[PDB]
Design an enzyme around this catalytic site. Structure first.
Site, PDB file in Angstrom:
ATOM      1  N   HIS A   1       0.865  -1.163   0.000  1.00 57.03           N
ATOM      2  CA  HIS A   1       0.000   0.000   0.000  1.00 57.03           C
ATOM      3  C   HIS A   1       0.910   1.223   0.000  1.00 57.03           C
ATOM      4  CE1 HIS A   1      -2.064  -3.373   1.877  1.00 57.03           C
ATOM      5  NE2 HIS A   1      -3.202  -2.843   1.460  1.00 57.03           N
TER       6      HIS A   1
ATOM      7  N   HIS B   1      -7.214  -1.396  17.476  1.00 56.94           N
ATOM      8  CA  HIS B   1      -7.867  -0.072  17.585  1.00 56.94           C
ATOM      9  C   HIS B   1      -8.057   0.485  16.173  1.00 56.94           C
ATOM     10  CE1 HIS B   1      -6.779  -0.452  21.884  1.00 56.94           C
ATOM     11  NE2 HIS B   1      -5.578  -0.764  21.429  1.00 56.94           N
TER      12      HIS B   1
ATOM     13  N   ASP C   1      -7.999   3.179  -1.792  1.00 56.00           N
ATOM     14  CA  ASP C   1      -8.430   2.053  -0.935  1.00 56.00           C
ATOM     15  C   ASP C   1      -9.957   2.173  -0.709  1.00 56.00           C
ATOM     16  OD1 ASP C   1      -8.348  -0.222   0.836  1.00 56.00           O
ATOM     17  OD2 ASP C   1      -6.470   0.446   1.753  1.00 56.00           O
TER      18      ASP C   1
END
Lengths: 339, 343
Positions: A173, A185, A256
Site C-alpha cells: 500500500h 484499535h 483504498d
C-alpha cells in the site's frame, strides 16, 4: 448491449448472482468495475456465470477484481489451489536462497492468476510490497520480508508469474504500510519517519515495480507527517509529486476502500490523483455517490482501465491448464500452502 | 494530600511522554478509572517509570494502567524490553515438541512479558488472544496460538500462570471469537455467519475455560454474528449478558469495543449503549476531545461490581520487589529463552 465508457468507481455485489437492482446499478456511467469477495463465491460454475452476467451488461466490459494474495487473504477456496502466505516465499529466501524463492514466487503468481482468469476475473490486487518491520498486524504475514531487496525481487518474480496467467499486478500500500502499528484499535497512527528513511527502504520496491511495468497501485490509509498532513490516498504530494512525477508511474492509482459524506471523500481522492475509487460493502453509498455524479475529466482513464483487462482468452486458458507443467505448478504451490 | 475518588467506568489515554496540565485535570475526573498506553507514550524505561508514577500519584485508588503487549507485531514498548515472540510460535512448539514443552514455553513468555511491564508501573497487558487460527483472518494472523481450541485453551492457561508470576491478570480477546471472519481491511466490520452451536463447539471454548480459571477481563470482537444478534458483540445484550454473564458465568471486566458510529465519525450515546449492552468500562482512545465531551455532566452508571472488577486487575507486585526478581539468574535465563523464541 449499451456502449458506455468505464467510469471511475469500482463497486461490489451482495451475493452469488446479480439481482435486478444490482444490474441497474452496474449500468450507471459512474461505474467501471467490480470487486468480488468470499460472499460472492459458491463454486467454480456459479462464479463463471456471475462474471459472465457482469460482463454482458455493457461494453467496454466491466473490469472484475478480487483480493487473492495468499494465506489468510484468499477469497475463493473450494476448487482453487490453496495459496501460501507471501511471507512463506520470504522464508524460502532465508532458508534456500534467492533463486529458489524467486522460482517459487513465479509459480505462485502463475497459479494464482491462471485459476482466476479461467473464472472471468481480470485482476488480483497483489502483491503487497509493504516491508515486514514487525510492527503491523493487519499486514502481518501478507508481507514478503523485512528487507526491501527481497520484497522487490520476490514481487518482480510474482509479477512475471501473474502475467503468464493473463494478469497485471497492483502494488500496495503506497508508500508503505509496514512501519505503522495496526491491530485492535480503529485509528490510523502516523508514520513519523522522514522521506529519506522511506526512500532507503519502503519506497524502493514501489520504484522498482513501477520501472518494470506494474499496472496499478493502491495507497495506504496512513499519514506521514514529515511529507504531508494528509493520508497518502488523499495527498497530492504523495500521488502526483512523488508517485507520478518523481517515480514516473503511469498506471492506475486505485483509492483504498472509502467506506471507512461519500461524494466529498471521492472528490478529495480524485483531486489527490486517484483514477478510480473503491466503495465496498455499501451499495447505499454507491447509490448516494452516483446520483448527480460528475465524472472527473481524466483523459488517461479509458487506457488505464483497458491495460488491466485480462490478456488471456477463454480457450487459451483452458489449454494452458491441461499442460503437465501447469498441473505441476498447481501441486507445487499446494505443497507450499500445506505442512 | 491526594484525593480519594472511586475509579470511574472510562479508560482514556495520553498524548506523549509526560502528562500535561490539561491531562492531569482530565485524569482527576470521576468518570475516569484507567489509562491505556501506546508506543507514542514510550521514550525509554526511565521516562516510562516517571510517567506511570505521575499517573498513579493523582488519586486513590490509583488509576489502572494497561498496554497491548501480546508479542510479535503487537508489542508497544521495544527498546529496553525483551522482544516477545508471536503467540503462534508457542503453537508451533506444541505441534513439534508436544504440549508439555509448549506450556512450559508459554509460562516463561507470560512471566517475562508481565514482569518487565510490572517493573515500569503497568498493571495489565491486554493478552492473551484466544481467537482460533481458522486460516481466514489476517489481522489476527500469527497472534493466534493455534487452530485447535484445546491447544489455544491450554497455551492460554499456561501463559496466564506466567502472567501471574509477573504480577498480572489476563484479558482474553476477542470475545466470542474473531478467528473465522476475514480481516484485511482495517476499518471494516466483518460478518461471521455461523450458528451459536458452531461457536460453542470451537471458538467459545477457550473463553469458557479461561473464565473458569480466573481470567480478569474480556475484550469483545468488533464483529457481527447475525444468527445470534444483528448487533456487534460489544453492543449486544445477548452476547454480553445472556451468553457471557449468565451461560458462561464470567464475573470479570467486560471492556468495550471503542467504536465511533456513523453518527459521530455523539460519544455520550455511544457510551450509553455500551453500558446498556453489558460493558463495565468503555475505552475512548486517540480522542481527548471526546473524553472531555463525555465526562462533562456524566452520570456514572450504577455498577456495584465495578470497584472490585477494577481492583482485581491491580498489579500484585511492588516496584522494589520486581527490580529484585529481575536481577535473579532464573529471571535473566527466562529473558534469554524468550528472546531466543523471538529471533
Amino acid at each position: 448491449v449499451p456502449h458506455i465508457p468505464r467510469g471511475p468507481v469500482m463497486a461490489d455485489i451482495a451475493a452469488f448472482r446479480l439481482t435486478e437492482e444490482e444490474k441497474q446499478r452496474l449500468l450507471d456511467p459512474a461505474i467501471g468495475g467490480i470487486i468480488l469477495f468470499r460472499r460472492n463465491f459458491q463454486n467454480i460454475e456459479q462464479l463463471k456465470t456471475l462474471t459472465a452476467e457482469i460482463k454482458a451488461l455493457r461494453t467496454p466490459e466491466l473490469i472484475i477484481a478480487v483480493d487473492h494474495e495468499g494465506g489468510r487473504v484468499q477469497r475463493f477456496i473450494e476448487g482453487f489451489t490453496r495459496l501460501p502466505a507471501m511471507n512463506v516465499l520470504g522464508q524460502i529466501w532465508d532458508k534456500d536462497g534467492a533463486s529458489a524463492a524467486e522460482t517459487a514466487a513465479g509459480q505462485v503468481g502463475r497459479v494464482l492468476a491462471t485459476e482466476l482468469s479461467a473464472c472471468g476475473i481480470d485482476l488480483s490486487f497483489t502483491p503487497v510490497l509493504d516491508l515486514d518491520w514487525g510492527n503491523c498486524a493487519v499486514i502481518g504475514n501478507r508481507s514478503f520480508h523485512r528487507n526491501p531487496e527481497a520484497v522487490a525481487r520476490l514481487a518482480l518474480a510474482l509479477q512475471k508469474g501473474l502475467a503468464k496467467g493473463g494478469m497485471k499486478s497492483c502494488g500496495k500500500h503506497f508508500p508503505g504500510h509496514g512501519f505503522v502499528e495496526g491491530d485492535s484499535h480503529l485509528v490510523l497512527p502516523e508514520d513519523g519517519r522522514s522521506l529519506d528513511e522511506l526512500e532507503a527502504a519502503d519506497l524502493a520496491p514501489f520504484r522498482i515495480m513501477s520501472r518494470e511495468g506494474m499496472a496499478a497501485v493502491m495507497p495506504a490509509h496512513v499519514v506521514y507527517p514529515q511529507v504531508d498532513t494528509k493520508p497518502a490516498g488523499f495527498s497530492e504530494i504523495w500521488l502526483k509529486q512523488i508517485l507520478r512525477r518523481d517515480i514516473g508511474f503511469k498506471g492506475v492509482i486505485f483509492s483504498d476502500d472509502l467506506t471507512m459524506g461519500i461524494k466529498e471523500r471521492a472528490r478529495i481522492s480524485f483531486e489527490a490523483g486517484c483514477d478510480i475509487v473503491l466503495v465496498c460493502n455499501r451499495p447505499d453509498l454507491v447509490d448516494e455517490l452516483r446520483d448527480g455524479f460528475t465524472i472527473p475529466d481524466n483523459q488517461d482513464l479509458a487506457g488505464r482501465w483497458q491495460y488491466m483487462e485480462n490478456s488471456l482468452g477463454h480457450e487459451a486458458v483452458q489449454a494452458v491448464m491441461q499442460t503437465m507443467g501447469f498441473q505441476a505448478a498447481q501441486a507445487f504451490v499446494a505443497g507450499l500452502a500445506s505442512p
